[PDB]
Amino acid sequence: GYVPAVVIGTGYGAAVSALRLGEAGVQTLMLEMGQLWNQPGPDGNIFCGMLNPDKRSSWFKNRTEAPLGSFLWLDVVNRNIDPYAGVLDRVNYDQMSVYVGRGVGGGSLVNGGMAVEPKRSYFEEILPRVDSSEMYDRYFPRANSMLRVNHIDTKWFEDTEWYKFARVSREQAGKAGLGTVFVPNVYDFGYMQREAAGEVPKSALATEVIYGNNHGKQSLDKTYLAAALGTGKVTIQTLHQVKTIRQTKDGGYALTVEQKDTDGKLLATKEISCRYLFLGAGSLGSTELLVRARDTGTLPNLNSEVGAGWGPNGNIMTARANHMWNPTGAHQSSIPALGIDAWDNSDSSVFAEIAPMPAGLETWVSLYLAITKNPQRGTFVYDAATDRAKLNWTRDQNAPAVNAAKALFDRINKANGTIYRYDLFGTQLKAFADDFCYHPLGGCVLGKATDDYGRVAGYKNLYVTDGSLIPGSVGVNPFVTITALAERNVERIIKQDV
Ligand SMILES: Cc1cc2nc3c(=O)[nH]c(=O)nc-3n(C[C@H](O)[C@H](O)[C@H](O)COP(=O)(O)OP(=O)(O)OC[C@H]3O[C@@H](n4cnc5c(N)ncnc54)[C@H](O)[C@@H]3O)c2cc1C
Numbered sequence: 001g002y003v004p005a006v007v008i009g010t011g012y013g014a015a016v017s018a019l020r021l022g023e024a025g026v027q028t029l030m031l032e033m034g035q036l037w038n039q040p041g042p043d044g045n046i047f048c049g050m051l052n053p054d055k056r057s058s059w060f061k062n063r064t065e066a067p068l069g070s071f072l073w074l075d076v077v078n079r080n081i082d083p084y085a086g087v088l089d090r091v092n093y094d095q096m097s098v099y100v101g102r103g104v105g106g107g108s109l110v111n112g113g114m115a116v117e118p119k120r121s122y123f124e125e126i127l128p129r130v131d132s133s134e135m136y137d138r139y140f141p142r143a144n145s146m147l148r149v150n151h152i153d154t155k156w157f158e159d160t161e162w163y164k165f166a167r168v169s170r171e172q173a174g175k176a177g178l179g180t181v182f183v184p185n186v187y188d189f190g191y192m193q194r195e196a197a198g199e200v201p202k203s204a205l206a207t208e209v210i211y212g213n214n215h216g217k218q219s220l221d222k223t224y225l226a227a228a229l230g231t232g233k234v235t236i237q238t239l240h241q242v243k244t245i246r247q248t249k250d251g252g253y254a255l256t257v258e259q260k261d262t263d264g265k266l267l268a269t270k271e272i273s274c275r276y277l278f279l280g281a282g283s284l285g286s287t288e289l290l291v292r293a294r295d296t297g298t299l300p301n302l303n304s305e306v307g308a309g310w311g312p313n314g315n316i317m318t319a320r321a322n323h324m325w326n327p328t329g330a331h332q333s334s335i336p337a338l339g340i341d342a343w344d345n346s347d348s349s350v351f352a353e354i355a356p357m358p359a360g361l362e363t364w365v366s367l368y369l370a371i372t373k374n375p376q377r378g379t380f381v382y383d384a385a386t387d388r389a390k391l392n393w394t395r396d397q398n399a400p401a402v403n404a405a406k407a408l409f410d411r412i413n414k415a416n417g418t419i420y421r422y423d424l425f426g427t428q429l430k431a432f433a434d435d436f437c438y439h440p441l442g443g444c445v446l447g448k449a450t451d452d453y454g455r456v457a458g459y460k461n462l463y464v465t466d467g468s469l470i471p472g473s474v475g476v477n478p479f480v481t482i483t484a485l486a487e488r489n490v491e492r493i494i495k496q497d498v
Helices: 012-023 071-077 120-126 132-147 154-159 161-175 189-196 224-230 282-295 395-416 479-497
Strands: 002-008 028-031 088-093 096-101 180-182 234-237 240-247 253-260 266-279 316-321 338-342 350-355 365-372 379-383 388-392 462-464
Touching: 002 012, 002 253, 002 282, 012 028, 012 224, 012 234, 012 266, 012 479, 028 240, 028 266, 096 282, 120 132, 132 224, 132 479, 154 161, 154 189, 161 180, 161 189, 161 338, 161 350, 161 365, 161 395, 224 234, 240 282, 266 282, 282 379, 282 388, 316 395, 350 395, 365 395
Parallel strands: 002 028, 002 266, 028 234, 266 462
Antiparallel strands: 088 096, 180 338, 240 253, 253 266, 316 365, 338 350, 350 365, 379 388
């Protein structure tokens, strides 16, 4: 049936959009292909931890997988599983694997909570058509407040065993003349203190993050989406995947929507129509819907920029072997708190999160997720044969990202007389993982596929809201940017269009 506004997905762009629509009095239906994560599972918890993965860990796979970097220690806990509507989806393209959340809250369910504003001068470089003053004066602050961003207590951080890993990398980076920064987070750091004191159930301190956190993490279901539901004007239907979008003969948009069970069985196909259609299906999902619509002739006026301009936020993972006298600790909080900021907007830029490892015993490894400035971009191209968007990225396109990460970590190795690990990402010697992405950005780029507020070119009342808007790179963990840009966009769209 008909609803005034439909929002596809329930990640950051979607959640912001739905809240503001509901506050404006616009009845809004959100369609989410994954689950509402609120049912206790076989262990009494909603989510599985990293040491006990089960079918809840994975979107329709037949075996669990170790978190990247951890195979040498966590393969032992892997098990065959039933394909199920689990929370983390590794999406495999030709030469790139992109990890995304599936559920009410999208990637907020599975991410590390790291809530970081981009450098203003870099924002101005990547999005020159956008007014940076309103972003920094108004929209970024609004996003941080509504996301429930908070800051770790420095004394607790300095003293706790749970962050020894971070302090070790800080000291090592310092010998190379590199500084660290604290990283704000949506995980409640007060709660985390009480976890360490044995006062509340552990989550971050029980090797949970990438398959969800049972406690502590303020994912979007607790923040924006709870508020959206609270308006009385928003509803969320789960296990509903939008497949096609067309412009109706009499006005607005019509969607074909598959309803499935948690085993993936098709229960129904429904037609849902609307006046205003907002895409918040992510870089991958929104772009796929639009390349499909263009190439199958249901939105034939979409432009050639739909599909273009994708990048992995320069994501590269690497690891160093510490000296025996610098153990990183058996107990590592699953929520990172420190990064190495070597980002100056030049091609050598690196912003690297000091990543915990989940092994739960001493390994002497320091792990890093580097964000780099690599101009290479990929394109999503529709394959009509399989009805899928395929990402045309090749592994060699990550060479500039590897080069920048390697130059930075080579400085740290030289200053400390340490070497890389080469064995964490497969049997072949490989110090830099260069074919994964946690931060997919682009495919429907702001000002290219859309106007400067995400209005899709060629169409009225059709909007993209999410990471597909970002031109491939923000230089930091992306969700605060996605949220702030969505605040800007929906506020303008409601004022001018609704
Ligand atoms: C392991 C990991 C760690 C990360 N750590 C951080 C971090 O600490 N900080 C940070 O800033 N970022 C982090 N990220 C990235 C961040 O989570 C994403 O950038 C962000 O979630 C993207 O928001 P979005 O709104 O574009 O889409 P998403 O959050 O991906 O949401 C899209 C939603 O749409 C749904 N959907 C897709 N297609 C359809 C369809 N056709 N029909 C219906 N529903 C659909 C999906 O199931 C999903 O729920 C991390 C991500 C991962 C995977």
